[PDB]
Amino acid sequence: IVGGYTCQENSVPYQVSLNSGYHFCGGSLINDQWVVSAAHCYKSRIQVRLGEHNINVLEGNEQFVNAAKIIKHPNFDRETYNNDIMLIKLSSPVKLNARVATVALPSSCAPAGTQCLISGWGNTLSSGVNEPDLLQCLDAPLLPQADCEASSSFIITDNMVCVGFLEGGKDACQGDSGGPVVCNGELQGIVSWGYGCALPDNPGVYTKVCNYVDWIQDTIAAN
Ligand SMILES: [Ca+2]
Numbered sequence: 001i002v003g004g005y006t007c008q009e010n011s012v013p014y015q016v017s018l019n020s021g022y023h024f025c026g027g028s029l030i031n032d033q034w035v036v037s038a039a040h041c042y043k044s045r046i047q048v049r050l051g052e053h054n055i056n057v058l059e060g061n062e063q064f065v066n067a068a069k070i071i072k073h074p075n076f077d078r079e080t081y082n083n084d085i086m087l088i089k090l091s092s093p094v095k096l097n098a099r100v101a102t103v104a105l106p107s108s109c110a111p112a113g114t115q116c117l118i119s120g121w122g123n124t125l126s127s128g129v130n131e132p133d134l135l136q137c138l139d140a141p142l143l144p145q146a147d148c149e150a151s152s153s154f155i156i157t158d159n160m161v162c163v164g165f166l167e168g169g170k171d172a173c174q175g176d177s178g179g180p181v182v183c184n185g186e187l188q189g190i191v192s193w194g195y196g197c198a199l200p201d202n203p204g205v206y207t208k209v210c211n212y213v214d215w216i217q218d219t220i221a222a223n
Contacts, residue, residue: 001118001119001120001122001124001132001136001137001138001171001172001173001176002123002124002125002126002169002170002171002172002173002197002198003126003138003169003170003171003198004118004119004124004136004137004138004170005136005137005138006132006134006135006136006137007053007119007134007135007136007137009053009059010051010053010061010098010099011137012117012119012135012137012180012182013029013051013098013099013100013101014028014029014030014101014102014103014180014182014187015027015028015029015052015119015120015135015179015180016028016029016035016048016049016050016052017048017049017052017055017121018037018041018043018046018047018048018049018088018178019046019047019048019049019064020043020045020046020047023049023055023121023131023175024041024043024175025037025038025041025175025177025178025179026119026120026121026122026175026176026177026178026179026180026191027041027048027088027178027179028103028179028180028182028187028190029050029094029100029101029102029103030102030103030104030105030187030216031102031220032093032094032096032102033089033090033092033093033094034087034088034089034090034220035048035067035087035088035090036085036086036087036088036187036190036209036216037085037086037087037088037178037179037190038084038085038086038177038178038190038191038192038207039072039073039076039083039084039085039086040076040078040081040084040177040178040192040193041086041177041178042070042072042086043070044070045066045067046066046067046070046088047064047065047066047067048064048065048066048067048088048090049062049063049064050062050063050064050065050094050100051063051099051100052135053134053135054133054134055121055133055135056133057133061099061100063094063095063100065090065091065092065094066090066091067088067089067090067091068089068090068091069087069088069089069223070086070087070088071086071087071088071089071219071223072085072086073085073086073212073215080157081160081192081193081205082157082159082160083159083207084159084190084192084193084207085190085207085209085212085215085216086178087216087219087220089220089223103180103182103185103186103187104185104186104187105186105187105209105213105216105217106186106187106188106209106210106213107186108210109188109208109210109211110142110183110184110186110188110210111142112141112142112143112144112147113141113142114141114142114183114184114188115139115140115141115183116139116140116141116142116163116181116182116183116188116189117137117138117139117140117180117181117182117183118137118138118140118163118164118172118176118179118180118181118189118191118204119135119136119137119138119176119179119180120135120136120172120175120176120179120180120191121134121135121136121175121176122136122172122173122174122175122176122177122179122191123173123174123175123176123197124136124173125173125197126168126169126171126173126196126197126198126199129174131175138170138171138172140163140164140165140170140181141163141164142161142162142163142183142188142189143161143162143163143164143166143203145161145162147162147166148162148166148203149162150166150201151166151201152195152201152202152203153195153201153202154194154195154202154205156205158208158211159207159208159211160192160205160206160207160208161188161189161205161206161207161208162203162204162205162206163181163189163203163204163206164203164204165203166200166201166203167200168198168199168200168201168202169198169200170198171194171197171198171199171203171204172191172194172197172204172206173194173197173198174197176191177191177192177193178190178191179191181206187209188208188209188210189206189207189208189209190206190207190209191204191206192204192205192206192207193205
């Protein structure tokens with residue numbers, strides 16, 4: 001997260017870190033045994049880390065659980081990142097508490113202008129790379145598609161939504177991928193891609209979770 005602020009410790013209880021020997025993506029806890037992330041974050045094996053604040057220091061609220069099933073959306077397109085969503089079923093249910101909690105799925109597609117919270121342990125620089133120890137937060141609004149593409153060097157599909165600032169300076173970045181965009185207590189987006197990070201005229205692009213509520217529920221029920 002570039003241009004954000006350090007989240008208060010465990011203040012984003014649904015935020016998880018996907019780890020394969022190091023942090024590589026984020027995710028969101030949606031029930032005691034399922035995590036939703038981005039399909040581009042797929043790996044053959046993944047350890048899910050919950051209750052984290054400092055990912056490099058054991059602070060006492062961590063729960064590390066291995067992924068049992070890692071299910072990418074069947075229509076995920078690696079070239080365009082269309083349908084960039086994935087479900088992870090944990091090998092065992094986690095213990096839900098104040099610091100490890102679930103986030104609700106969207107009841108509808110939120111409108112442009114809705115204020116949200118984006119979070120993650122991704123790169124904090126708009127140039128170069130800096131991986132933060134502590135979870136970063138960013139208050140950002142959903143943007144109108146037309147506004148987003150006006151002077152950007154990209155376009156988005158109906159399964160994507162731009163979130164952020166047209167002026168740049170504040171945005172998600174590499175390492176935040178798969179993480180949450182929560183608005184009014186509902187997961188409306190998943191960090192997916194962008195052109196650079198925090199660059200003017202190039203807001204971040206996120207998977208529009210409201211288009212996948214049925215797939216998510218069906219998948220969970222089928223497994
Ligand atoms: Ca820790």
